[PDB]
Structure 1
Amino acid sequence: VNEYVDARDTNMGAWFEAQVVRVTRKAPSRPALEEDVIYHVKYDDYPENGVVQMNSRDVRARARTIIKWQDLEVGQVVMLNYNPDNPKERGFWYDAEISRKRETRTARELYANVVLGDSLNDCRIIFVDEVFKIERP
């Protein structure tokens, strides 16, 4: 019945849970711009940052579907958790492309190219059971 979205902070490149407050019309600032729509979003866990003005590219339906480990393939673009400054700890949700997958009786390792804005190639993903499917169209 709702109406739930993810908002991408433009400087970290990560996606955060958010809600849409207003939709306004951005009149072109220059002739080489078209009249586009602005989405006014607020972050669910950061209401101190007030409202942010974003475009449709940085707002999308909220991630709901987890891709099981057995169903992860090399080359898929997914939303996973990663911490660039502490790769062994919990981090933020970035879009990434799975680059390497390995499984043994003991270990389950996954490497992906993490998009942050720049790109990070072959990041060792810790949370291989919390890989989300990106919702489209």
Structure 2
Amino acid sequence: SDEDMWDETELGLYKVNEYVDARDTNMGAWFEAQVVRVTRKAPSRPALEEDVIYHVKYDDYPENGVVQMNSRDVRARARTIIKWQDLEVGQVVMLNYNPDNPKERGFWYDAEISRKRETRTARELYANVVLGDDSLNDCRIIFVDEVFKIERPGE
């Protein structure tokens, strides 16, 4: 076996210099980052995206250094907002939530829209917010005009 051996690659799904979102595995949120190097472990195998290690710098956390990511924790940078009128229960989107202080600005989490209400006085959005392998149901989402479409690589 050769999990310890790696080489650079230019044939990862994401490329050096690409602006991406990268997911912190300790707290489950996505952050703006840039890919600075792409390596691939196990040179004995045919090239697999599962073997790619992305080396990223988080835009707002330079003190974290060059962080290594599994391919599942990198995706193209979110760029398109799904406006209020287009949001629907069941959509999985990236949105801003603060689990510790839910009235405040927080971090960017993936979330499944769970309830959408329009009353005479407010637009109310609720979502099941993903943290790692688990989710918090029915979080009230403050930032209803900044919900992002997730860029999926496809298959």
TM-score with structure 1 setting the length: 0.91
Aligned residues: 137
Cα-to-partner distance string for 1:8-29 (whole Å, 9 max, x where unaligned): 0001100000000111122389
Q: Contact 1:39–1:53 (CA<8 Å) still a contact in 2?
A: yes
3-state SS in 2 of match to 1:97: strand
User: Are the equivalent residues in 1 in contact too, given 2:128–2:135 (CA < 8 A)?
Assistant: yes
Distance 1:62 1:122, change over 3 A: same
Decide whether aligned partners of structure 1 residues 83 and 112 sit closer, same or farther in structure 2, where only a CA change above 3 A counts.
same
SS of residue matched to 2:18: coil
TM-score normalised over the length of structure 2: 0.81
Change (3 A) 1:112 1:34: closer
Select the structure that is richer in strand.
1
Residues 52/29 of structure 1: CA separation in 2 closer, same or farther (3 Å cut) = farther
Name segments (4+ residues, structure 1) moved above 3 Å.
28-35
Is the Cα–Cα contact under 8 Å of residues 27 and 34 in structure 1 kept in the other structure? Answer: no
In structure 1, distance between residues paired with 2:46 and 2:39: 19
Q: Is the 8 A contact 1:5 1:62 kept in 2?
A: yes
Alpha-carbon contact 2:22-2:74 (below 8 Å) kept = yes
- The 8 Å contact of residues 78 and 149 in structure 2, kept in 1 or not, is answered as yes
Cα distance, 1:85–1:35 mapped onto 2, change above 3 Å: closer
Shift of 1:3: 3.0
Q: Distance in 2 between matches of 1:59 and 1:129?
A: 24
Shift of 1:32: 16
Q: What does 1:68-107 align with in structure 2 at a 5 Å threshold?
A: 68-107=83-122
Q: Secondary structure at the match of 1:130?
A: coil
Cα distance, 1:128–1:23 mapped onto 2, change above 3 Å: same
- How much does 1:33 deviate? 11
Alpha-carbon distance between aligned partners in 1 of 2:85 and 2:48, rounded to the nearest angstrom: 45
The percent of aligned pairs where both chains have the same amino acid is 100
- Contact 2:17/2:35, CA 8 A, preserved across alignment: no
Unaligned runs of 5+ in 2: 1-15
How big is each residue's C-alpha offset from its partner over 1:10-65, in whole Å with a ceiling of 9 and x where there is no partner? 01100000000111122389999997111001101111110111111100000000
- Give 1:4 shift: 1.6
Compared CA separation, residues 33 and 4, structure 1 to 2 (3 A):
closer
Gaps of 5+ in 1: none
* Distance in 1 separating the partners of 2:106 and 2:144: 13
Deviation at 1:105, TM superposition (A): 2.2
Alignment RMSD? 2.9
Q: Which moved more, 1:1-10 or 1:71-80?
A: 1-10
